Ligand binder design. Sequence first.
Ligand SMILES: *[C@@H]1O[C@H](CO[C@@H]2O[C@@H](C)[C@@H](O)[C@@H](O)[C@@H]2O)[C@@H](O[C@@H]2O[C@H](CO)[C@@H](O[C@@H]3O[C@H](CO)[C@@H](O)[C@H](O[C@H]4O[C@H](CO)[C@@H](O)[C@H](O)[C@@H]4O)[C@@H]3O)[C@H](O)[C@H]2NC(C)=O)[C@H](O)[C@H]1NC(C)=O
Ligand SMILES: *[C@@H]1O[C@H](CO[C@@H]2O[C@@H](C)[C@@H](O)[C@@H](O)[C@@H]2O)[C@@H](O)[C@H](O)[C@H]1NC(C)=O
Ligand code: NAG
Ligand code: NAG
Ligand code: NAG
Length: 523
Amino acid sequence: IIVTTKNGKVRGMNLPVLGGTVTAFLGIPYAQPPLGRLRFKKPQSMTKWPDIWNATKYANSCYQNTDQSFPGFVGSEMWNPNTELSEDCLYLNVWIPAPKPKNATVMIWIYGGGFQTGTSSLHVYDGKFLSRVERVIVVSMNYRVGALGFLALPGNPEAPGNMGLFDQQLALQWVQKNIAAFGGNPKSVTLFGESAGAVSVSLHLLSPRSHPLFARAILQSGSSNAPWAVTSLYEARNRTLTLAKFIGCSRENETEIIKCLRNKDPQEILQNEVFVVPNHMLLSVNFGPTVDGDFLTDLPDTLLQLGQFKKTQILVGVNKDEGTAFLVYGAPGFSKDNNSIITRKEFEEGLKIFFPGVSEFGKESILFHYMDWTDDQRAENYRDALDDVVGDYDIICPALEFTKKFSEMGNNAFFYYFEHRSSKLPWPEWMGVMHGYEIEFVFGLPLERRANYTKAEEILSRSIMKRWANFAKYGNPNNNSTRWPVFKSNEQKYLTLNAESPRVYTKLRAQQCRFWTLFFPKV
Ligand SMILES: *[C@@H]1O[C@H](CO[C@@H]2O[C@@H](C)[C@@H](O)[C@@H](O)[C@@H]2O)[C@@H](O[C@@H]2O[C@H](CO)[C@@H](O[C@@H]3O[C@H](CO)[C@@H](O)[C@H](O[C@H]4O[C@H](CO)[C@@H](O)[C@H](O)[C@@H]4O)[C@@H]3O)[C@H](O)[C@H]2NC(C)=O)[C@H](O)[C@H]1NC(C)=O
Ligand SMILES: *[C@@H]1O[C@H](CO[C@@H]2O[C@@H](C)[C@@H](O)[C@@H](O)[C@@H]2O)[C@@H](O)[C@H](O)[C@H]1NC(C)=O
Ligand SMILES: *[C@@H]1O[C@H](CO)[C@@H](O)[C@H](O)[C@H]1NC(C)=O
Ligand SMILES: *[C@@H]1O[C@H](CO)[C@@H](O)[C@H](O)[C@H]1NC(C)=O
Ligand SMILES: *[C@@H]1O[C@H](CO)[C@@H](O)[C@H](O)[C@H]1NC(C)=O
């Protein structure tokens, strides 16, 4: 099962997948480990090995703080790393169908986690079913997160910033130089990711040196024009100097502030990593993408206006209840153990968490347009509205504006609206169709009948996998099934995804997105 790469031979394995076989290569090194003097630096090219590399096991996950908000709760711990943590984490995984193809489409997955957490070895990112059913090749890599991946000093090569984004770009280059040996076409590469991974995919669309590294893009619950996606260059410097203060590496020679951090323990860096931002949450990307002038030369909104992006097809979409997962981690009155009926005082305190710098009249504008504009006097009125406030502002409306921008320029786009709640979802009912729970349907986990999903969930997962692979192969997700129309700038049609009957509507959340883009900036 041995495949020869440009750096050496790799040894894989055969997996029983749905009455067939999928060949897996887990842990192929694609970059020199960023240890010692290489910490905070851009990734270096991988060295050559003369032997056989046993890529038969998930490699290490990058250092990251783990979620401990709900101890022993499977709904939150399923996202925590499931391999040993280590700075030596730059590895990728490949899934090849059986029998071996000759020019298969390659889909490369980029995980999320607010640019502070995440690994490619999670069970919900297992790409064996996708390669088995749709006969594509699936690739996924680990990239540095947190300060170890996004510590930024402007123009300083010791810590230039966006290093985790360069980790992804180097893994993309590995697929160009090597995927033909495994049976994949380097000209049919589609990037797909969720949340911060969707921000990463949409940042490769705005980085010219990544354009020749892929063909198409899929954005799941995220886009680089979201308010939490990118910080300014001076903002990232403020946060590096803040981390140095807490950890005790504050110097007036900047280039030697990095030599001090390079001698701190990674666990020590993670502990002071949280004090950098005024309030640590999921959307408080303390060390994430910045306008570094190298990987990213301008704010994503500016680049979209100037048409400075890869002209190609994109497949974007969001989930029905995007904000609930974020409210349970910070907003007062929200709990996973009760229905979270919040009061008006708790609503206004939730706005203060997710809108830290806006005035009291600005909060009164959000409150009027989401509550007092309608007669909704139900007991869940404030709870559901705060879900829509965070969902529209941070995920849904930015993703719709990104899709609109690709459409104005004349590129074909396809927008979805995921509406299905997993029967195995461990979170309570009030959270609904949560952020991050379309991924198991994209990766075909309900196809294992021993996983005890409903029969309709296996059908829905096969439908979503089919549309995802069709878009990667032919640039169009579409036959006698319900046709998925092209998102045009004028009509703005989208397709809902659910286990009953997919439907086509127009102008998703139009009234709310018009408030965030046309009126709220003026208050
Ligand atoms: C849904 O659940 C949330 C979360 O509550 C916590 O989890 C639940 C699963 C359950 O175990 C709860 O007991 C647990 O607290 C609820 O929101 C919390 O509500 C409590 C009160 O019910 C708040 O704590 C109080 O806050 C005040 C200011 O600090 C203060 O008055 C209280 O202290 C005083 O009272 C206690 C007696 O409770 C006494 O021991 C003290 O000495 C003092 O006198 C108390 O600390 C939490 O802050 C709330 N959490 C938030 C806002 O995040 C929520 O009410 C619940 N909703 C429904 C509809 O059931
Ligand atoms: C690499 O693996 C060789 C063969 O191991 C067998 O096949 C692989 C695919 C796995 O299924 C494994 O569990 C099997 O035992 C070993 O002979 C060889 O020693 C390994 N190389 C190193 C460096 O450990
Ligand atoms: C694979 O497809 C590309 C175009 O997409 C073509 O140039 C190439 O010759 C094909 N076959 C291979 C690499 O065997
Ligand atoms: C970061 O910015 C704040 C905003 O005013 C400023 O007060 C603070 O001194 C800065 N921190 C630094 C430069 O470490
Ligand atoms: C699934 O449901 C069946 C119902 O008979 C049960 O036997 C089984 O233990 C459940 N769980 C799994 C993981 O198969």
